[PDB]
């Protein structure tokens, strides 16, 4: 299965487990911040400085 | 060959305290609040030290220094309100921790219970002196009322209050020495917590059944490190909900006003985690009797082992004493609510009945009810 492959390739050794965690932390920070920011600026659309700055 | 975890002198101490420590296999979530307390302590030392990198204890700049921390220091509002709501979380965890000790008879561990009383007093002193530091209206006038309470002491009250002030009133010298004491005290608290754990590990933890668990001990590390981590994450969730969604829920707006010794606030209350005591002291008309009651309401924790009259240790198998315990918790809630209220009808008679009931429960009702339970079980 997919999880068997993931374990055999990336999880079995602790060094490779840690490397997977580090690369995943980098890409997760990027994607999670992008998504959370988009949610926050959709909830508050038109209310923020960024939305209105282009008039001044 | 050796395992350096077991042979190395430092790692041996660490190993015996948190890795290979035999722990009861059945201690509940209520046994998490020890590890929360020590975490809160660390958080308070961490944010406070970072506050102390910008805060200044001169009365001409303290309130301004705090405004600067929250307005211009990078993430200084985070550190500030993390510190304030972490003091509130410290006291929540302390009250739950002492309530667990009461309910399960953990006070039968005499030395660690007595060290815990010392710790409660020292955390209270630290939080009290820290709250003066922003030098808001509540800071100033709460310091004023609580320090002038000590004048009730016979023959040396005024002399000792003036010595604590370093002057004729709460002023600059008081604020600077309160900053110094507030800085130093949490490290003494750390030492006392270490002594506390040293005394606890002599017997190990009590469990919810109140029965000795040596036949079912599990190693601390895999089980209670992960359980304490989960408890810490839940505590962090509550703390961050406070810090990020209602920063000012448990505080007072009048401390956003700089201290005015000419004008007093309409209401001068301690913080919430003092109100139960502030109610008790305010219930008694006599100044000194009120102070003695406000001190006995926390010294009475030293009496619990001598008040124990049950054949059983914990409250798990004693419905009547559970009833009294929950009445005690309700009376503490009503004392907190009363202490947040003005001294006027009807809160006065309510505070009086609650203050009487607190002592009547701990000192009288709980012992007699344990004896009745003893006879109901025919021993």
């Amino acid at each position: 299965t997919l999880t068997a492959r993931l374990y055999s390739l990336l999880f079995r050794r602790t060094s490779t487990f840690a490397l997977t965690i580090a690369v995943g932390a980098l890409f997760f920070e990027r994607a999670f911040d992008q998504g959370a920011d988009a949610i926050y600026e959709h909830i508050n659309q038109g209310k923020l400085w960024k939305h209105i700055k282009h008039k001044y | 060959m050796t395992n350096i975890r077991k042979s190395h002198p430092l790692m041996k101490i660490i190993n015996n305290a948190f890795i290979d420590l035999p722990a009861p296999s059945n201690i509940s979530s209520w046994w998490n609040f020890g590890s929360l307390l020590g975490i809160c302590l660390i958080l308070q030392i961490l944010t406070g030290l970072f506050l102390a990198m910008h805060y200044t204890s001169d009365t001409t700049t303290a309130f301004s220094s705090v405004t600067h921390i929250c307005r211009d220091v990078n993430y200084g509002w985070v550190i500030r309100y993390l510190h304030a709501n972490g003091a509130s979380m410290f006291f929540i965890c302390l009250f739950i921790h002492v309530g667990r000790g009461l309910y399960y008879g953990s006070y039968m561990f005499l030395e660690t219970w007595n060290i815990g009383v010392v710790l409660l007093f020292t955390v209270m002193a630290t939080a009290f002196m820290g709250y003066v530091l922003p030098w808001g209206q509540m800071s100033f006038w709460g310091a004023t009322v609580i320090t002038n309470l000590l004048s009730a002491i016979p023959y040396i009250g005024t002399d000792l209050v003036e010595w604590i002030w370093g002057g004729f009133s709460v002023d600059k010298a008081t604020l600077t020495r309160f900053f110094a004491f507030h800085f130093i005290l949490p490290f003494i608290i750390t030492a006392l917590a270490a002594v506390h754990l040293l005394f606890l590990h002599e017997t190990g933890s009590n469990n919810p059944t109140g029965i000795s668990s040596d036949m079912d001990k599990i190693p601390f590390h895999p089980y209670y490190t992960i359980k304490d981590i989960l408890g810490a994450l839940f505590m962090m969730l509550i703390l961050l909900i406070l810090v990020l969604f209602s920063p000012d829920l448990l505080g007072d707006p009048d401390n956003y006003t700089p201290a005015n010794p000419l004008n007093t606030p309409p209401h001068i209350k301690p913080e919430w985690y003092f109100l139960f005591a502030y109610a008790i002291l305010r219930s008694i008309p006599n100044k000194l009797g009120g102070v003695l009651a406000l001190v006995a309401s926390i010294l009475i924790l030293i009496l619990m082992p001598m008040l124990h009259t049950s054949k059983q240790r914990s409250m798990m198998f004693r419905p009547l004493s559970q009833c009294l315990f929950w009445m005690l918790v309700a009376d503490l809630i009503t004392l907190t609510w009363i202490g947040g209220q003005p001294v006027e009808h009807p809160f006065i008679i309510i505070g009086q009945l609650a203050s009487i009931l607190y002592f009547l429960i701990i000192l009288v009702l709980m012992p007699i009810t344990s004896i009745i339970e003893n006879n109901l079980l025919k021993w």
């Binding site: - | 559970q322 929950w326 009445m327 309700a330 006027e344 009807p346 309510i350």
Partner: protein
Amino acid sequence: REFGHLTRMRHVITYSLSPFEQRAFPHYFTKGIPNVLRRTRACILRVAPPFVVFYLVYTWGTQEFEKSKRKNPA
């Protein structure tokens, strides 16, 4: 106090499974919900009545206090 010298125990057998052989949330709802309800009935009359009394006392004190600040015709 260390493992290996805590008590004498005899004739007790324990059977355990590896965490990788079993699940971490088995019957979490089909069994957990009845257990929570059982644990709630077991204690509810020991815990709840004091807080009901506090609710009533708080409600009465607050409404009464606010009933004193009202003008009584006189």
